[PDB]
Each structure stands twice: as structure tokens, then as C-alpha cells.
From Swiss-Prot, chains A, D, F, H:
Binding partners and assembly: The enzyme is an oligomer of 12 copies of the alpha and beta chains.
EC number(s) given by UniProt: 1.13.11.3
Organism domain of life: Bacteria
Organism: Acinetobacter baylyi (strain ATCC 33305 / BD413 / ADP1)
Biological pathway: Aromatic compound metabolism; beta-ketoadipate pathway; 3-carboxy-cis,cis-muconate from 3,4-dihydroxybenzoate: step 1/1
Alphabetized InterPro entries for the sequence: Intradiol_dOase_C (IPR000627), Intradiol_dOase_core (IPR015889), Intradiol_RC_Dioxygenase (IPR050770), Protocat_dOase_a (IPR012786)
Binding site for 3,4-dihydroxybenzoate: H135
Stated name of the protein: Protocatechuate 3,4-dioxygenase alpha chain
Lineage of the species this protein comes from: Bacteria, Pseudomonadati, Pseudomonadota, Gammaproteobacteria, Moraxellales
UniProtKB/Swiss-Prot annotation, chains B, C, E, G:
Recorded metabolic or biological pathway in which this protein acts: Aromatic compound metabolism; beta-ketoadipate pathway; 3-carboxy-cis,cis-muconate from 3,4-dihydroxybenzoate: step 1/1
Family statement: Belongs to the intradiol ring-cleavage dioxygenase family.
This enzyme's EC code(s): 1.13.11.3
Positions bound to Fe cation: Y106, Y145, H158, H160
Protein name: Protocatechuate 3,4-dioxygenase beta chain
Length: 202, 238, 238, 202, 238, 202, 238, 202
């Protein structure tokens, strides 16, 4: 048996490599980005946005974020999904973004995911898996985003219920807002300190 | 064969979040312990990227940004295999890399080091591993560079890499170094890794038989991701 | 002989309060240093428990909760001596123990592990040491068990024990393990102890000459408490 | 010379063994508990109660607490007490309790202790020695409870005065309350953080 | 590929028939040397057992005899590979196992040890290896047990196993033990094996990455049978 | 190259595992046993029986025995048989039995095997391969059973002739008996001592 | 304290019955294994011998048979302690010794060696150990002597001894040798003992501080017998 | 813990030291011998005699034998006897003898012992414990002598029943004979070979 290759920080330039187009480097014809909605993608369009704060409350303007999620019916666009249901064929389920260098704001355009089966016949509430990389972060930090308008489902979510501090569970719930007809979920991430966001070892 | 969960990440084989010798980590590391969860379909699935979308020079950092001529620096090929912890090849995984040029300078807005920019070098590439977990790319060896941690800190030459493979739980970003670089012994970032054997797991080895005469040198570097266990009794994933 | 204070506790021989690899300690350890005080009668005295109140099977975990039959598992006797750091026997000290059953399951409300409960096993016992500091009890060897620290964490087989002796300053709770258990090497709780020699001080040794033919095995395990110094000049305790 | 056996946490089930009767395990005829008052015990009856909080402010519902104290005249029921005074014969001076699984509240029924001699002819203010064990606590934590109505004695207490931060001394003083004729002292323990309780190496 | 005979059994890698420290062998071992023969079709053939006849729980000793509940004891998975001496996998071989329960008690008429019987445990299982020579079964870890050789003799925990494979000459019955069991060092049965390296070949190793969180531990144990040589010149078998 | 896994005795309970049904353990629906004759099996039915004796002449009541043999035409029901002849399709060729706990008697119901080719164009006399396991036997003991009514074939058998002591050859010949129409071959095995049975390293 | 059985005799610490290099053992050793039994009152009891019956010179082999003068040879005192395996003294045990004279000649009918007989030497003595397990006797150092095993076999100098103590199971006869005797390395009788550490357990050590000036040398030699275990649960002896 | 001192043969002169008077060495006033009957000893007088044979059937003329036994009521004259019954005060329970140099015959004059409790409430049949030392015997050989006229008790004896070979049990039974009014039990010991006497590890 082999040991996993050790993690190292992404460092301050984690976008030359992961988002070149926005470091103004035109090397690729097809570029990966933060838009998971294609024209025929099924489901309700939502915008996910927020900022990432260090231990003094300053937003990180060098952070790289990715999300991974199921389609509108709760099926993952992955060969490893074993539900035996057909996934939306016009949905990658993944995206990547950086924070705006000035403001620190990050965002994704995606669809609200459907509920996914949990272990042993349980059902998970709708969620998006999120990972954060940045200078100073030695290993990518994993967290999840749940939705405040799914309070009934959240109350029965296996993962949320496995957090014994009911006050920390709330750091994982994004707030629904409605900016000019568009549905927006605001999810701020506090890496360290008061109201520190829950991070998982998955 | 019915697959179960990925084996638990062995935290003693990785850097801790808080590592005071790497100053930036002091305010960017959680104070609370990570919450371990039992895996669900969310953690064992991951996206698929099609080969069709990749261009012909995506893995050739020597030519993919060359405009008027070739970039200046040491021509090197880097290759190796990506496998999981139980030794199985990781097929069609997305490998992305990025790095400084021969001067130790990044083509990034925020890099103001005096090492010279190279108009024919971009510094990023990507590839998918093949059915044997093999990958290969060509580049210019990066120069070491100064950064402010203590005032005279210098990173050894290194290439940053990222892997998206079969399960979200395998998601990994790290950096590899070049055999014999004397800065490897003094770097506070590499020293966040607790054990000497794991620090050596990030050093790419000179592969002399694979050098190409009058053309390029070659380094060998393998990567190991977490592996999934097989289930033979109850399958509790769902 | 006029007694003075107990010798200072050697903090380097014990786990620190904050031990990040044992996740629950992160929020249950003081941020401030402990305040050391010079001892008074409060710290050098302790209660006395009379032998009269103990029942005949209090130290026999095999029979003290047996209802319809015997508990299932490995019959073992554990014995040894309790002394202070200067080697003197600790007489009439109260020793209490508790543990899981052969499946690694505790008869506790909050234990929902799938290892089976044993209707004839309770899991707790107590005894007073004799005039030579000797103690002996019989039990079922406990099974190792899973717990959530990292997701696949497993405690080696162990018996929890507690001692109330002559001085409140001697108050101690700890756990002992069984020679050869391979989980001993991976446990984050045992690894909170800094030195290898102190981790070995918690391993009970196979005592083959003391096995009872066609009946039970035996383990030897000695315990050392803090000892008092004698005063020959000024007695400042009072 | 030998080294002290190393401490290890009591773990989450520290009551199967130390308070079986309340884990519903009937193995012993005589069970140790939190009532130090016997019918002929001398002195004023008091109830000592409180909760133990972790670093996020959540009460520990798995904690085990013991107290050790002198009788009404400040004499310990121990062979090691050298005052040469007779101790109350109907007083053990020790008790043990757990926190209520639901609320986190713990309590003891005991008597207010008399003043005990300090070192070199000094006099200590009335106090109860207390120790806490729980999952996550690697070594039992020692502290003391003094009484807010003994302000004159507290002001001259050697141990309290040896704490240089006068703001931390107050964490050791319990508050007197009078619930339906009964005297109650409320003593909350904060293991970590703001107003963290003083713990001693004794 | 035309097959020839199995390689000669290396008698120095096995216990001798007469081993006085194992008392029962004194009257059950031949006085004459074994007569070695050259192999014929009789020795190179063996029966075939169809997978169709095996039930779903035949390799699950935890559930195959459970009536009202689960057996008490340590939940463990044992797996590994069966290959021949030249390293080839042994496919579709019949593996049968039997063992005591967690108390060290056999569900056999003649076992009168006081260790308690478990009404939900039977103690026997079987499986066929797959095309890679792989096998897997689940059980309760057996307890060590006393027997009369010298009066206080104790067998380490062990599982008895039997293999019927491709050739009658490969027929083998043996027993495996668990890493770290201190009784391994004192057992007269294990000591009938002359060399230390062969005694270690019977010890199943802790396989921590393959443990199943909050469920079962796992041990890895491989088995090597005699292998056949290929014939390239005269084929004298017939 | 690897070394063969070392043999160890089967021990006194070699039937919990190998003949559970007769240790009264009902775990398997299909159980292996000592009856090799199925209704359409070809050949003459014979019963093979005997006892196994230790060095003092006491029968072993804990012994496990298996036999392996060819069909009526001398073909093995094994993929490794290279005669290119078709084997009887209703014949496993193998069986297993234990000795009766009281008497020590063991038996099998099978068919008399046909002659099998020997090495280099020779022909072996009809035989059954037999192996014995028991407490005290560190490695299974291999022997063969030939038939006393095949004296002409036995005289030319390569294996029997390779035993230089003509007095030991006779220990391998079972005696034909005819109990109520049934043909029975009695084969007693003496592990040690006078008239010790020949055992082979195969 | 309620006593249980003596600990099992460890057969690997003693010579085997059949030891072909010691020729006389070939026809005087059982072919069958010894039958181990669980102890009863028969095995844990033994006779008591009163000090009253011993004469004043019973432990003085120099004077107890002297008639006209002193025996010729090296005056030596031998002393030491008899304890059981758990270290407890063996009190009032009967120790008997016998030996050849300074020439290596026994005062026995059947001894026809040419080494000269000594009219003032008898060669036998006895004593009871005291409350500390101590014994002391004085004698003439015996000479080595020839015997017929191979034709030129020679026993190192030795004193035969016998102990009857508290339990019949402790009954022991053996022989001790003198530090530095070069014949110790070649004796087939001493070589029947399997381990080197046990052969050294029979060598009496020079005790120079205890020599008596202008009188006698002294050798120290301790003896260990089997020890009894204490019973704390069921007492099955009766 | 210490290891037992290793045994060594008594050698050919085991009587200079253990029976000097009969090697004609007068060193002791009081000599130990083979007569366990004192004038007031209670019980029936019996003579125990026999010979010890090597593997070729030759008697050993250099053997030393001791016996250990209970009194007429089955009580041992030992402080370690816990029956709480009073032992015959005129009985040592032990004796020692050598074989006659010419004939090889050995004998003891003693009393027939009463039945002694066995383990767990069982009762042992009447027996005498016997040990043999001689040149060639590396460790003293332990055996027991039972009596043929106690067949009912012998049938229920725990130790005899623990010998699985019923043919070997008989080697432990001495035969009663009546020479001129005296009761004699003949017990021959065969160290090796046919009808080898059972020896125990006790
Ligand atoms: Fe970099
Ligand atoms: Fe525990
Ligand atoms: Fe077994
Ligand atoms: Fe001698």
C-alpha cells in the first residue's frame, strides 16, 4: 500500500493555472469557469455568492473556489452515481471561480440541486459541496452550502445533524435573496474565529 | 465489484492547517477541528471532462504561448503515473499545472519580482491521464524565487499541480520539486509536511534514459490519490 | 516521621491539555496555563472508604452482573501493585474500573455501535488495595471499538481505571491496554502521551505462570501514584 | 524512583464506572453519590450547583465531578489531617456527580465548610476542592469553589491572593442564592475562553 | 502449455510428523519414512465444486447461524489471495474455515470449557476463490483457549482452514493466527514448524485501510499452494 | 518463488468445519458427505470401510478422511485429466467422512474405479487415493487403497512395485467381503507400529 | 491467603527424558509422553522433617566421617538460598548432598576407579533451610572423574543434591558445578539441558568476600523450586 | 520471576547420599528408610513391593524410590493439607528405598491409605504417589499405585479416568497377594516399552 501524495498550498497565483483567462493568459480555447447553466439545463437557476474572510475579518482576494453538485433531480453527472436514474445531459455539476481582486466577492451561476440519497436509506437535504484553496491554506478546505428555504429537509439532514453544536450548523446555511427577479443565495465563509464556518474531513 | 467509500485520509501524512513557520497560515487556518463524516454519493462522485475540448498544445508549455520564438530556459519533459493508494491506475483524471518562468517570475498581475518576464512563456498546462494512469507534459524548468515570509525566504524551483479524478474526496492540489535542489532543505512550505518520507514523495527524479538527445531532459514523478474499498457484505452508501 | 507535601507532578510525563489529534480536546482544554500552588491540608488529605460497604462480587466482572448465564468472551484475571513514586505501597486505595464488553460495546445509553450487547455483562467493578498495595479483579477481555475522531478511528482494547488514595493530589484516572494489541500504535488518545516510555507504562503484560489452567488467562499491571516527601526541618504545611 | 502512571481521558462513558446506578446498571448494593449530608451531620446545609461549558459555550452533558472538603469546623475526615481536633464522625467529605444528560446541570447536597489552616500559620477562606473529568479532558482539572458571602476571609486567602490577575480570582467565587428556604451556591465552570475558570496544578 | 508434475513438497518447510512437545503426535506419527512417488494423473487432478450449491451467507460467520440476534465478539473481515509457489492465482479453490467463538469455545460435543457458548454463533464457513485467487469472509475474532498438552497450555486465537484446489497433491489444512497475539510465541503446535520465517507465514496482518468505519476490522492473509511445472520436452505423466 | 504455506494439525474438532451437519450444526443447505453414488452413476457399487488405529492400537474417534478416485472407466472428473475420454457426468469422484464417535468406524459408498494410465505408458491397478487428518497429525497422511481381487493388476502396478519391502505392500490392499448382496472392502489403517500402513509423499 | 496449585513445570527448562548423547538414558526413558494432571491435595502436600533428629555434624562433610584425621583436599564452604519461582523463601526444606572425594572416588561398592579412597571422608550431608531459605554446609571440593559413556568421558567436579520441600510437585534432584571448571563445556549430562542460561543456573560461584582466611574458600549457589499461585476466586483444589 | 533449577540425573550412586546406612556409611544417628509404620500407627499394614525394568526387561539395581501418601483416614501429615481433620500423629507418610543390588527387588512397609478428596468435590480412589530416580533418568519419574481390591473406587477416580487409553490405566493397579497372613501388593514398573507404566507431569 502507498501513502497519498501530501497536500501543499495552492499559493497566491493559484489562478495562472486554474483560471488563466482571468489572469489574462490566453493559452486554451476552451476554458473552465463558474457558469454551470447551459441553455437546456433543467431546474431553477440560482446565483451563489459570498466572500471568504481571514481571522481578522479581511476578505481573501486570492482565493480559488470550486463547487460540486447534483442536478435538479438529485442525480450526479458521474459514472460513480449508482441511483440508476438518468442525469440531466446538459449539466457538468462542477465549476470554478476566483474572488474579484478588488472586492473579494466570488459567485457561481448554477441550479438549485435536488435531494440526494444519504447512507442507509436516509435522504440528504439539497446541498452543494464546496472547496477552498489559497495561499496560507495547506490543504483544500471542504464545506457544504445548504439553503435556508429548505428548513424542513435541513432538520432531517444526516450530515447537519451529525454536528453536535447546533450553533455551528447555522454557518452552513446560505440566505435566499431576490435581486431583480433572480434568486441569490449569499454564503459567506469565515475561515477562522467567531462564527467560523464548519469544515469537513470527507 | 460494488464500491464502498474511499479510505480515510491519513492526516499524519499531510501538513496540519496551522503551521506558524509559514506565516500566512496563522490567520487562514480554522481554530476548530475538522468534522469527519461518513461518505455519501456526494463524496464518491466527481465530474468528467472530455478529451475533445483539450487543444493539441495544452500539455506543451514550451509552445503553447510561444509567439515570436521559443521561451528561454531548460527544456524538460515531466512524466509519470497517477494511481490510488491500493495501486490501481487513475484513468482520465484532469491534471492541471502552473509555474513561474526560468527567472522565477509568474505571469501574474501581482508578481513584481525583478527576475525577467519571458514574452514567449505562459506557465500553465493541462492533460488527462490515460488508461494506465500515465501523464506527460513538456515545459521550461522554473527558477526558484523570493517571497516574503521571513525577509530572505526563497522557494525551491517547483511546479504547482492539481488533480480532479473519480471521487470528490480525492481532490488534491500540491507542488513537486526537482531532485537535488538545495533550497528543498530550507523551505518553510515544504516543512509543513511532518515526515521526511512524505517530503520526499514530492521530489521529481532525474530520468536519464528518457532524456532526448540534443533536445530535452526528463523527470519522473508519480502521484498517489486516495483509493476506494470494495464492499462484499452490506452496502450502506445508499 | 512527619510528612511534607507530595512531589510536584512532572507535566512532561503526562499528556498536555490541548492535543489537536484528539479532536474533542480542542474545545475542552484551558487556554490559560495551570496555576501551581504550594500544598495545604486540602491537597494532602483524601477520603476513606470502608471495606464493609463492598459486596463479594464487586471485583468479579464475570459474575457481578450475570443473570441467566455467563458473559461471552475471554476470561482474564488482572492483578498488580499500586505504589507511590518513592516505591512505597499504597494501602486501602479505592480502585474503580469500567469497560466495554467482548464486542467493544458499552452498556451506556449513548452507545449505538452494532457490536452486540451481552445481557450477562455489566462492565464495572471496584476493590480496595491491600496492605501491600496489591489488587486483583476478574473480567472479560474488552473488544476494541470504533469512535468518531477521524471517521475510521478505533480504540485498542482497554480498561478505564480510577484511583482515590491518600492525598487529593494523587487523584488519577487513566486507561490500560493489553500487550501486543496492534491498535496501540495508532491510537490518538494514547499518543497524547509524549514519551514512548510513558506510553508503555499503560500496557498490561501477559503473566503466563499465573494463568489458571482450563479457566482464565492473567495480565499483570502496576500503577504508580505521586509520593509524599518527609520533613526533617521546618514543617510549613501548617 | 518511578514515574507517575500517565493520565488518560475518562472518555464519554466515565459513568458506567463511576456512577453505574445512573447509567441504570445495578451491580453494587452500596453506591457512591452526590449527597454528603447524613442525618446527624453537623453544619449548615447548602446545595452546590452549576454547569460546565466548552469553548463554544455549550454545556458538557458527559462530565463527571467530584468534590473534597472539610467539615463544619474545618477538619478533614482523613488520617492525614494533623490538626489534632476531632472531625464530625458523620461526614465523608467527598462526593461524586454527573451532569444531567438533558440540561447539563450538576449538583451536590453538602454543608458549608469551616476555615482550614493554610501554610505557615495562615488561614484559608472556606472552600471546596473540585475536580472535573470528561471526554476531551486528558487530565482531571482541579479548581476550588469559594463563597461570595465570605468576602472578608476571601480577601486574606493565600491561594486566591497567589493569583496575580485580580479579574481571574472572581471565577472561583460561587454566588449565594436562597431558593425556598434552601441556601444554594451557583458555580458555573468555563473550561476555555472568556472568563475561563482558574485551574490549578496541585 | 502442457503441464507436468507439481514441484516436490519441501519437507523442511513443514512440521515433522513426530514432534514430542505436541504430545498427541507421539502415538499418531508413522515410524517409517514417507515413500516418495513420481506423480501420475491421480496426484495432479482434484474435484470441482460448483458455486451454485453455496448459500449467500456461507462466508459470513457473523450471520449464518444468527437466530435471535448477533453473536457477541469482535467483528472482523479476513481476506487475501491464494496463489501457487510460482505466483499464479489459484482460481475456484474451495476454502473452508472453522473456529471457536469469542470465549474460545467450540460448538462441538466434546468441548466442555467453561468459556460461554454463544447461541448466535456457529463457527464454520466456506467460499470459492475468484479468478484472481481472492477470498473474503467475515467472522467474530475467536478467543484463545486452554487444552491439555501440558496442564496450562493455551492456544493463541486461531482460525482453522482447509483448501481443495487443482491437484490432489496441493491438499492442505492449516491454521492462521492474528498479528501481535502474545500466545503465538509459546504454542507447541505452532512450534512444530521448524523455521521462524514459516511460522510467520501463518500470521494474518492488521489491514487498517480496509477497516470499515463503525463496523469491522480487517486482517489480510495470503496462502501459497504447491505449483505445477510446465513441460517442454518429453511428457512422461502418461 | 514463494514457499508453500506450512501445514498444521486439523485438531480435535476438524468436523465443526468439515462435516458440520454431523456436529449438529445446520449452517449449509448443501452438505458434502461420504456418498459418491448418484442415481445414474455408472459402475459397480462398493462400500469402503475400516478404522484408523494409533500406536497403542486404539481407534481414533476424531479422524477426518477424504478419498479421491476415478470413475468406472478410469477417468477423473477433473479438468486436469488429459485422457481425452469423457468422464461419467454423474460422478464427483470425491467424498469426506468422519469416524463414528463411539466405534471409530468410518465408511464411504462409492464405485469400484477403473484402471488409470501410469507414467510412460504404464497402467496403474484400480486404486482410491485417501488422506487422513486428526489431532496429533501435523500434516495430512496420504495413502492408497488397492483391491485384493485385482491381484493380476496389482502385481504390475508401478507404485506398489516401487515399495521395496514386499511385506509393506500388503498394507495397501483392502479385503473384499460380501455382506447381504453388497460388496464391502475392509481397509484398516495403522498409523504407527507393527503392520504400519505405507504413507506417501505425493 | 488461600493457596491454589503449583505453576506448571516448564518442560523446556529441563532436560528431555530421551537424550542419546547420555547413553544410559536410551533404555531408561519412557516412549510415551508424560500425562499432565490437574493438582490435588496429593501433589501440593509433602512431609515434614524435624530438626531434632539431625546431628551437629550433619552438614559438615569435613568432620562427620573423620576418624584419625582430616580428609585430604580443598576445604570449601557452600551456601545460598532456596526460593520458589515467585521469589519466596522456602523454609525448613530438607537438603541432602552427596559427592566423591578429592580423588573423584565415591565410597560406594561399585566404584573401582583408581583415584584413592580417603579413610576420613564419607561424602554425604544434609540440612534444613532456615526461615530465610538459607543453607550452609562445609565439605572437601570433589575431584572430576571418569565414567563410561564414550570411553574417555569425564564428569566435571560436582555435588549431587536433593530437595524435599512444601509440595510433592516441588521434588527435585540435580547437581551443581564449580565456576571455571573446563569440563563443564564437554559433559554430556550437563548438555542434556537445552538452554545455555539453564546450564549456567547449575554453576556455583566463587564468593571471595566470604572466604575464611587461612582456612576455607566459599561458593555461593542458589536454588529455585516451583511456586504456588494464590487463589482469589473459586478454589477448586478440593 | 525465576526459572526452576534444572533437573539432572541422580546418577549410579544416588544412595551414598540418600541411603548411606545401606552403602555402609555410618554418618547419621537417625536414618530415613522404607518403614512408615510406627508402633501406634493406625490402619491396615501392607507391604508394597516390586521391581523396576529398563527397555530390554532388565531390572534396575541402582534405582532410588520414594513414596508419599495419606494416613488411614485419607489425611496428609502436611501443613498444606486443608481438610481440617486431624491426621494420625504417628505417621510420617513418606519413605525411601533402593532396590536390592542382587535381585532388583524394592519394598516398603506402610499402611493402606484412605480415600482423599479430589478437585471440585470429587473423591479419589486410595493411592500412593511414587517417584523414581536412577542413572539414566534425567528427571524423577512420577507415577501412582492404586489397589486392585478397590475396583469400585478406581472406576470413579478422576486421575485414572483422565487417561484415555483404558489399557494403560491398568499399569497403575497393584495386585493384592497374601503371604503368610501379611497383605502384599506387587507393583512392577516398566520404564519403557510394552506395558510401559503411565508417568505423570504433576
Ligand atoms: Fe509557486
Ligand atoms: Fe473506552
Ligand atoms: Fe482450534
Ligand atoms: Fe556423581
Amino acid at each position: 500500500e502507498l501513502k497519498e501524495t501530501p497536500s501543499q498550498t495552492g499559493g497566491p497565483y493559484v489562478h495562472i493555472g486554474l483560471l488563466p483567462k482571468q489572469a489574462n493568459i490566453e493559452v486554451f480555447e476552451h476554458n473552465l469557469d463558474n457558469n454551470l447553466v447551459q441553455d437546456n439545463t433543467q431546474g431553477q437557476r440560482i446565483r451563489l455568492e459570498g466572500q471568504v474572510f481571514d481571522g481578522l475579518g479581511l476578505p481573501l482576494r486570492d482565493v480559488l473556489i470550486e463547487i460540486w453538485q447534483a442536478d435538479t433531480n438529485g442525480v450526479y453527472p458521474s459514472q460513480a452515481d449508482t441511483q440508476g436514474k438518468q442525469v440531466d445531459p446538459n449539466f457538468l455539476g462542477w465549476g470554478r471561480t476566483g474572488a474579484d481582486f478588488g472586492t473579494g466577492f466570488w459567485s457561481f451561476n448554477t441550479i438549485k440541486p435536488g435531494a440526494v440519497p444519504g447512507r442507509k436509506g436516509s435522504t440528504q437535504a439539497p446541498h452543494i459541496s464546496l472547496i477552498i484553496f489559497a495561499h496560507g491554506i495547506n490543504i483544500g478546505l471542504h464545506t457544504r452550502v445548504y439553503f435556508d428555504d429548505e428548513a424542513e429537509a435541513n432538520a432531517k439532514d444526516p450530515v447537519l445533524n451529525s454536528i453536535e453544536w447546533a450553533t455551528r450548523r447555522q454557518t452552513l446555511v446560505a440566505k435566499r435573496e431576490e435581486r431583480d427577479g433572480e434568486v441569490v443565495y449569499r454564503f459567506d465563509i469565515r475561515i477562522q474565529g467567531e462564527n467560523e464556518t464548519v469544515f469537513f474531513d470527507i | 465489484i460494488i464500491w464502498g467509500a474511499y479510505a480515510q485520509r491519513n492526516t499524519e501524512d499531510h501538513p496540519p492547517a496551522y503551521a506558524p513557520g509559514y506565516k500566512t497560515s496563522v490567520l487562514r487556518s480554522p481554530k476548530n477541528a475538522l468534522i469527519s463524516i461518513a461518505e455519501t454519493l456526494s463524496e464518491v462522485t466527481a465530474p468528467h471532462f472530455s478529451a475533445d475540448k483539450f487543444g493539441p498544445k495544452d500539455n506543451d508549455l514550451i509552445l503553447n504561448y510561444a509567439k515570436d520564438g521559443l521561451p528561454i530556459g531548460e527544456r524538460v519533459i515531466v512524466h509519470g503515473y497517477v494511481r490510488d493508494q491500493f495501486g490501481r491506475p487513475v484513468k482520465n483524471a484532469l491534471v492541471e499545472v502552473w509555474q513561474a518562468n526560468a527567472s522565477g517570475r509568474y505571469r501574474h498581475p501581482n508578481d513584481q519580482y525583478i527576475g525577467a518576464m519571458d514574452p514567449n512563456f505562459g506557465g500553465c498546462g493541462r492533460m488527462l491521464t490515460d488508461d494506465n494512469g500515465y501523464y506527460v507534459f513538456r515545459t521550461i524548468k522554473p527558477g526558484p524565487y523570493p517571497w516574503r515570509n521571513r525577509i530572505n525566504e526563497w522557494r525551491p524551483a517547483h511546479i504547482h499541480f492539481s488533480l480532479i479524478a473519480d471521487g470528490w474526496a480525492q481532490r488534491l492540489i500540491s507542488q513537486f520539486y526537482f531532485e537535488g535542489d538545495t533550497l528543498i532543505d530550507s523551505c518553510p512550505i515544504l516543512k509543513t509536511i511532518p515526515s521526511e518520507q512524505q517530503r520526499r514523495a514530492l521530489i521529481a527524479l532525474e530520468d536519464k534514459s528518457n532524456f532526448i538527445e540534443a533536445d530535452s531532459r526528463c523527470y519522473r514523478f508519480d502521484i498517489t490519490l486516495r483509493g476506494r474499498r470494495a464492499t462484499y457484505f452490506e452496502n450502506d452508501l445508499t
